[PDB]
Design a protein around this ligand. Structure first.
Ligand SMILES: O=c1ccc2ccc(O)cc2o1
Ligand SMILES: O=c1ccc2ccc(O)cc2o1
Ligand SMILES: [Cl-]
Ligand SMILES: [Cl-]
Ligand SMILES: [Cl-]
Ligand SMILES: [Cl-]
Ligand code: NA
Ligand code: NA
Lengths: 407, 407
């Protein structure tokens, strides 16, 4: 099997519109969570969200927007960023050896609802002719593959919270096995009431911190009360090592492990043992210690704990366990975008020699008192190997491990 | 690489609720297309559809239905059928070596619209707590993985019309490379006005045959005027050859080729050259002649023709080209379900030694007069190798090749 490296990154996040803004937010523990006035107007319990702040029309031209919902428009921006970061020529983007696996947890729910509404109000013709590519589950891959003239692999993986972790892992496999030499991998999610309401109705999102929105997402806090939803996108450029070296690529890291398993247990709560198997699978090909864990931890009573127990089973407790810092306390949970964004946060922390605070822990849950959850930013630390989990509804698990390239 | 065989099949289709009914429909060219009265009531141009006729409540119990939209309920039925056909024990279904890649072109658009409607009419709580797994793009994998206690791989691929072809191809790869020994692969789609209207608004569906619905889908006919939408599901059980042989499995066929490419051209029309590359990739690992082609051909002016030219480029014209019969003329286009259903139709034709008529060709398009499009059922033919294309919006291409197992 060939070695696979990350040569470019792009991101649209609740904590920044590019990698520089994201890095500053991570370093300063600047929350991306704000009040969602619209959710209050609609009668939601949860009235907080993690909204990107970015001017799409200034970055994606009108004709290029024809088939984009707002999630895939963010993904287009992230792809432009990743291409620029990697320094790719047009020929390097568009060729038979270069593919795309780009996913979202759902499609444009807003397009679907707006279309149903206008059908009933003004008639089917008034849906317009461009709604299908926005409404389909493959929207993120179809729109970008077409626009960027991708000629190799083209499809989406979805797996709820795990979506863009599996997209990256499958793209990794394609390159390892020699089927493609370069891949664009990642994902996105729109942020829209038509999606958020589904989670509010199940009671899954935070509602006890509506008056202090910035601190509503608080993984590992004793009084965590649900996740905070977000939208955004991320893209990695992946290349086989020889391809990267030969063109003088930047190497942000090497992908050195990938795990994917299934709980076969509960639709909306994890079993724990599935996560253990997933992390073990990712670690089976890794020969250095793990220096940092970017957990799944979404700030839920039932979710944060089983993952911690899984981590304890593999790594032990206390100082011998890698430092753990939940970036979702700053960013919220961007569903399809989460895996790739967390890969990017982890790679940026590696680049900049720090581990962010696990934010908004006002009172640590005593169940986790034995674990090295980061309470204050750790500076001047050399990270060489980082692990990131994403564990999604339907018992779907994905873990990725990235390593500093040193030959 | 390991060899991979199909050991069980399940299907819910517009042309039958199991493989026996489907076989009878193929043999007798019995159309599955009917009038869609609801589409007329809503003001659609197209007023035809391919609707399954199956009693879900009699086949999936109430608690098992909690997280199913109607597409994934059909997929559950197809999975039960495939498990029974393969003769699998509970331990063979649920183990770390057995996974699922099961997709849909979209999620339950009906769940999304109903939820938005009830939010506005009665409040967010009245969405209920079970809508998320129905509305997410991974619905088909999440629901079945959880219910059937799947422990290995668990995710969905989506790629519009190509969805379940890529699901099968990626599952094939997993087994080839030794990561899993058994996979459930396939997909589904609900049939609902909230999805169909998106296609009617783009003018993509047939509307000149509303008064003769049964003949509205007519691939290769001079007067074809758009596809006919359908819903349903299909599942294949895939196993590495040694696993299959050792347990006395039925072998419906061996997967011997898989192609996946990208046009990088137009969102809603094919380039043709992408399809050539896709078929060539699938054929690169095949060492016998092709005895039958199950085309993408959806009964559209702009779609049927470029595929025929691609076929002509690879295979030539006339008698030296494999017989071509478009099953969508009987079945309509079931989007996420199409690839796996067409695999099943092709394997059933192989099993039963016939090639179905390419139905509803009242006047052949003169552009295709040189091609061996099947005008009347061909009997007493031994099929050993069959090829099936699916080419989806966003320029996404997938081809599979199956072969009669003879050692
Ligand atoms: O990651 C997810 C999980 C559920 C889900 C449900 C609906 C949707 O539109 C997107 C979603 O993304
Ligand atoms: O195969 C498809 C293509 C487009 C599409 C669009 C919306 C949807 O809900 C399902 C779909 O399936
Ligand atoms: Cl979107
Ligand atoms: Cl459940
Ligand atoms: Cl469904
Ligand atoms: Cl286009
Ligand atoms: Na993570
Ligand atoms: Na086909």
């Amino acid at each position: 099997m060939r070695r696979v490296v990350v040569t470019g990154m792009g991101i649209v996040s609740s904590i920044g519109s590019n990698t520089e803004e994201v890095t500053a937010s991570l370093r300063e523990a600047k929350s991306g969570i704000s009040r969602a006035e619209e959710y209050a107007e609609l009668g939601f319990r949860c009235q907080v969200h993690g909204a990107p702040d970015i001017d799409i029309e200034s970055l994606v031209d009108r004709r290029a927007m024809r088939f984009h919902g707002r999630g895939t428009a963010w993904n287009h921006i992230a792809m432009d960023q990743a291409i620029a970061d990697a320094g790719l020529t047009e020929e390097e983007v568009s060729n038979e050896r270069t593919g795309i696996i780009m996913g979202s947890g759902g499609p444009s729910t807003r397009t679907i609802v707006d279309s149903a509404d206008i059908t009933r109000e003004k008639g089917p013709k008034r849906v317009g002719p461009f709604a299908v590519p926005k409404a389909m589950s493959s929207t993120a891959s179809a729109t970008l593959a077409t626009f960027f003239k991708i000629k190799g692999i083209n499809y989406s993986i979805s797996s709820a919270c795990a979506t863009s972790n599996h997209c990256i892992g499958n793209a990794y496999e394609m390159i390892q096995y020699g089927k493609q030499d370069r891949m664009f991998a990642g994902g996105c999610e729109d942020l829209d009431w038509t999606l958020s309401v589904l989670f509010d109705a199940m009671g899954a999102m935070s509602s006890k911190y509506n008056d202090t929105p910035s601190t509503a997402s608080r993984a590992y806090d004793k009084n965590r009360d649900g996740f905070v939803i977000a939208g955004g996108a991320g893209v990695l450029v992946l290349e086989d090592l020889e391809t990267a070296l030969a063109r003088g690529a930047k190497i942000y890291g090497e992908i050195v492990g990938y795990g994917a398993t299934s709980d076969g247990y509960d639709m909306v709560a994890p079993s724990g043992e599935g996560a253990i198997r997933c992390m073990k699978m990712a670690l089976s090909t890794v020969t250095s210690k793990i220096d940092y864990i970017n957990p799944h931890a979404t700030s839920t009573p039932a979710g944060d704990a089983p993952e911690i127990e899984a981590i304890r089973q593999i790594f032990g407790a206390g100082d011998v366990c890698p430092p753990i810092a939940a970036t979702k306390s700053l960013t919220g949970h961007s569903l399809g975008a989460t895996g790739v964004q967390e890969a990017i946060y982890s790679l940026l922390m590696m680049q900049n020699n720090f581990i962010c605070e696990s934010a908004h822990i006002e009172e640590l849950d005593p169940a986790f008192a034995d674990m090295p959850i980061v309470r204050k930013r750790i500076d001047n630390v050399q990270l060489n190997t980082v692990l990131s989990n994403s564990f999604g509804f339907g018992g779907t698990n994905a873990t990725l491990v990235f390593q500093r390239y040193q030959g």
